[PDB]
Design a protein around this ligand. Structure first.
Ligand SMILES: Cc1nc(Nc2ncc(C(=O)Nc3c(C)cccc3Cl)s2)cc(N2CCN(CCO)CC2)n1
Ligand SMILES: [Zn+2]
Length: 264
């Protein structure tokens, strides 16, 4: 676009995460001594859809695009580099004396502020999870993995038939009828919050995948994690209302966390 770069501006240092689809590297942009992350693929417009969505989004809590290389293979997307990796591994491995309750709360305020931004732009993410969040210094958390993100035309996006999703993060109307909406991102946010409050447990632990929809339909929701405040649990419960209209908006979610945050 106007976001092209010459391949030779960047030195690929080491690999961070390979794919069945494609791989991820850390590199240096010589011309500024800046560390960047570089995503790539081989044997286009899918990989590119992610590029196109990140062009349009500019919020301090969404991993920022720095450029692209998309006239010749290998094709590159380049972004700022998050030094402490994905949020899930960060939670599982941190010092709990260093990440307190108040840090966990801060992390959630950041995420709700990125989604507040994206809801107003009418983008859906479609893969909210703690594995798809990235961490930086000072406990900056940034939302990432935008490869299923889409600008919606109205209020619902329907994915193709035959399309399979991570069950424990996906809203029931999405599992039943394949319908995504901002409200289905709300649900996954809920599930993300519980991953945070538990320092990185797996959702529905010890429940067969095959039973989740049904359990849900008959009323079951995950329980309050140990140490999690009532109001944060009630918020996380509102995210899981069976009816998408009944769930909160990301404005409201953001409002509730900023408020809790300032009151500590
Ligand atoms: C897998 C991984 N990513 C890291 N940082 C990233 N920054 C930006 C990344 C990225 O994916 N951006 C991006 C997005 C969001 C969309 C399209 C295209 C692109 Cl390019 S990935 C750090 C890291 N860690 C290795 C383990 N170490 C543990 C010690 O704490 C520390 C570092 N591992
Ligand atoms: Zn707000």
């Amino acid at each position: 676009d106007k976001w092209e770069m010459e391949r030779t501006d960047i030195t690929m240092k080491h690999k961070l995460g390979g794919g069945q689809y494609g791989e991820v590297y850390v590199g240096v942009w010589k011309k500024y001594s800046l560390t960047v992350a570089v995503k790539t693929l081989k044997e286009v417009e899918e990989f590119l859809k992610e590029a196109a969505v990140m062009k349009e989004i500019k919020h301090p809590n969404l991993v920022q695009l720095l450029g692209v290389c998309t006239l010749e293979p290998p094709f590159y997307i380049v972004t700022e580099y998050m030094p402490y990796g994905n949020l899930l591994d960060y939670l599982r491995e941190c010092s709990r004396e260093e990440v307190t309750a108040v840090v966990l709360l801060y992390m959630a305020t950041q995420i709700s502020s990125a989604m507040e931004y994206l809801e107003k732009k009418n983008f859906i993410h479609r893969d909210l999870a703690a594995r798809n969040c990235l961490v930086g210094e000072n406990h900056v958390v940034k939302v990432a993995d935008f490869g299923l993100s889409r600008l919606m035309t109205g209020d619902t996006y329907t994915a193709h038939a035959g399309a399979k999703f991570p069950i424990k993060w996906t809203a029931p109307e999405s599992l039943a009828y394949n319908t995504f909406s901002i409200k289905s991102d709300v649900w996954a946010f809920g599930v993300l919050l519980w991953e945070i409050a538990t320092y990185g447990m797996s959702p529905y632990p010890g429940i067969d995948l095959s039973q989740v929809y049904d359990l849900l339909e008959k009323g079951y929701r995950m329980e309050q994690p140990e140490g999690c405040p009532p109001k944060v649990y009630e918020l996380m419960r509102a995210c899981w209302k069976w009816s998408p209209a009944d769930r909160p908006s990301f404005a409201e979610t953001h409002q509730a966390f900023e408020t809790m945050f300032h009151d500590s």
